[PDB]
């Protein structure tokens, strides 16, 4: 029957021992000066409730049922300063306090591993209006576009997130998220006009007066108005974007 | 005096042993291939510094002083895709990448357990303008209202949070958070007018001209103006909301 | 050669034992009713993969390579209600559900320890328009200013973050982030006018008519217009901020 020594009252040990681990069936306390640690492991293999340190991702992880080796404690924000460099490259789960006082800097998103992989940046100097920041998604696309994206808003802060490859990167958490006037004096009596870029909504002024909603229809980047206007007429148009 | 065997130089063990736990008073290292794990426990009972895995909430938790069994590592974001379904039900601490390309989908917030319980959603397809999303709070109320709430903004992302039952759910973290023109030609000489919904602020135009702030007062969904206006007068009103 | 007892088949122990720790080289399972725990430690000294509980910060921490003793699981949000008090003081990593129904309350940011140190607040009652909240940064400055900051927006929620001492505190995560009309009838024929505060952009109306972009230039808090206007002229100016 019994296969191995048993110690009714347990026992004591006054030096570091060497085990091939075990199954605990009771309570694991500590005394002062006691230390603890995790296996420095790197594999993709594991089983739920199993836990490790990682000496590459410098991140205390735990194997979850759906997925496996997530960061322990869920999602989290690694707040570090970034010393201004023309180009910088950013690591998942880290958030960067950017300075653009020097001038315009760039940052390159990492290659996404898992969905959720989440990076964060913050205009902590409020310099982005004066000296913008651009965001290189690398091979993988951002909001569908492989093309980079620029940031122009003093004081802004954004969390980027991998959504899968079609839409690629997107913004999840964040903080901090165009007055056209075409005017001229009709050389002739004219029934239509074309604005330099399509406006969403527009206000029209004919001489002094504010023209009525009925007097025109607006479509794309052109404005018809019945009745057609006479020559010598100062018309103001306020393209809204 | 002594009650149990003592091992001056500690010892060695080349197989998995079986303990009723203990109190460590020194350093707990590991060698390569070493593994670690947590008790698969489910109770509400525990004591600070005590820690576990949970085989229901699939979440590495730790008993804190104020509260008890929180998720270890504080609050975190479980980023998963959601395959479009007319109805879906959402789990705390998880964040969902929603698609509404198919059409309009719905999601039901879980029953809140603790205050803080925090869910997150994201229009990762930018389809919410074209095909909105609605948010069922279930029995418990949202911002005071038991009534559901709809979302209409292309590209949006929101973190919901339980605040307690009076106000119920609210939005904490998030990203991405109405041109009325009444016009007519006064049949008669008229001293007042009623707008179809109360405007907050309004611009008034009488014939061509932009009427002065003194000429009217505005209240609720009606506009008085002294002096009272004459008949045959084209007046434009720009309800702002 | 051998220095300490070895137990080929490992062994068993039916009571809590007392160790000076060890190096595990195998697998550390558990049985039902098994418990676990961390050393209640307080020092700044430690080595990566080492982990502890803290009986002051009531926070399960782990020593990371760059930095040392971070909270395990990265950044996280400690959601608690705050019972309205004229003054309250706030702890890092905690997020407060504020009520200002009573009246105007204040909150004092803690002294920042590490960069990243991140506090969060939320107008969960939507009372901030009616009864504002103010934010004392203490000695350390907020966005450069040592001067406090007030909050006026019903429904808002903000994450504060320590960036370093020059800019001090800033806002990273968050949710929820001025109609001047000067009018008069020119006593005389006047070529310039001064607005009570500099406007960014402005709309000008002369009698009824909306004046053209060419007719004036705007600078600081003054408006020139060529040609200079005649006396008896009702002019409206819409300061935009």
The chain pair forming the largest interface, with residue counts per chain, is: A-B, 78 and 76 residues
Q: Helix content range of the residues of chain A, please?
A: under 10%
The third-level CATH topology of the largest domain in chain A is: Jelly Rolls
Number of domains of chain A: 3
Radius of gyration of chain A: 32 Å
Q: Please report the number of helical segments of chain A.
A: 0
PDB class: viral protein
Keywords: tailspike protein-protein interaction, beta jellyroll, viral protein
Assembly: trimeric
Entry title: Tailspike protein 4 (TSP4) from phage CBA120, residues 1-250, obtained in the presence of PEG8000
Q: Descriptors for this entry?
A:
viral protein, tailspike protein-protein interaction, homotrimer, 3 domains, mainly beta, 22 strands, elongated, 241 residues, 43% strand, TSP4 attachment to the tail baseplate, five-stranded mixed sheet, Jelly Rolls
Give me the secondary-structure topology:
The structure is a homotrimer of 241-residue chains.
Chain A lengths: L5 E2 L4 E2 L3 E14 L20 E2 L8 E4 L3 E4 L6 E5 L4 E3 L4 E5 L6 E4 L9 E6 L9 E4 L12 E3 L5 E6 L6 E7 L3 E7 L6 E3 L6 E6 L2 E2 L5 E4 L2 E4 L8 E7 L1
Parallel strand pairs in A: 7-9, 8-10, 9-11, 10-12
Antiparallel strand pairs in A: 4-5, 5-6, 11-14, 12-13, 14-15, 16-22, 17-21, 18-19, 18-22, 20-21
């Amino acid at each position: 029957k019994p296969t191995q020594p048993l110690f009714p009252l347990g026992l004591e040990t006054s030096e570091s021992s060497n085990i091939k681990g075990f199954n605990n069936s009771g309570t694991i306390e500590h005394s002062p000066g006691a230390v603890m640690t995790f296996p420095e492991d790197t594999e993709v293999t594991g089983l739920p409730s199993s836990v490790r340190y990682n000496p590459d991702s410098d991140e205390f992880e735990g194997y979850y049922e759906n997925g496996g080796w997530l960061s322990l404690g869920g999602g989290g924000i690694r707040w570090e300063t970034l010393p201004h460099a023309p180009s910088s490259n950013l690591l998942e789960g880290r958030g960067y306090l950017i300075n653009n006082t020097t001038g315009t800097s760039t940052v390159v998103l990492p290659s996404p591993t898992r969905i959720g992989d989440s990076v964060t940046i913050c205009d902590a100097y409020g310099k982005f209006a004066t000296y913008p920041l651009t965001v290189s998604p690398s091979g993988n696309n951002l909001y569908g576009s492989t093309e980079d994206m620029a940031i122009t808003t003093d004081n802004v802060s954004a969390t980027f997130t991998w959504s899968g490859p079609e839409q690629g990167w997107v913004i999840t958490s964040g903080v901090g998220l165009s007055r056209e006037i075409f005017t001229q004096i009709l050389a002739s009596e004219t029934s239509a006009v074309t604005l330099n870029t399509p406006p969403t909504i527009v206000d029209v002024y004919a001489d002094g007066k504010r023209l009525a909603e009925s007097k025109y229809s607006l479509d794309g980047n052109v404005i018809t108005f019945s009745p057609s206007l006479p020559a010598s007429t100062e018309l103001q148009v306020i393209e809204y974007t």
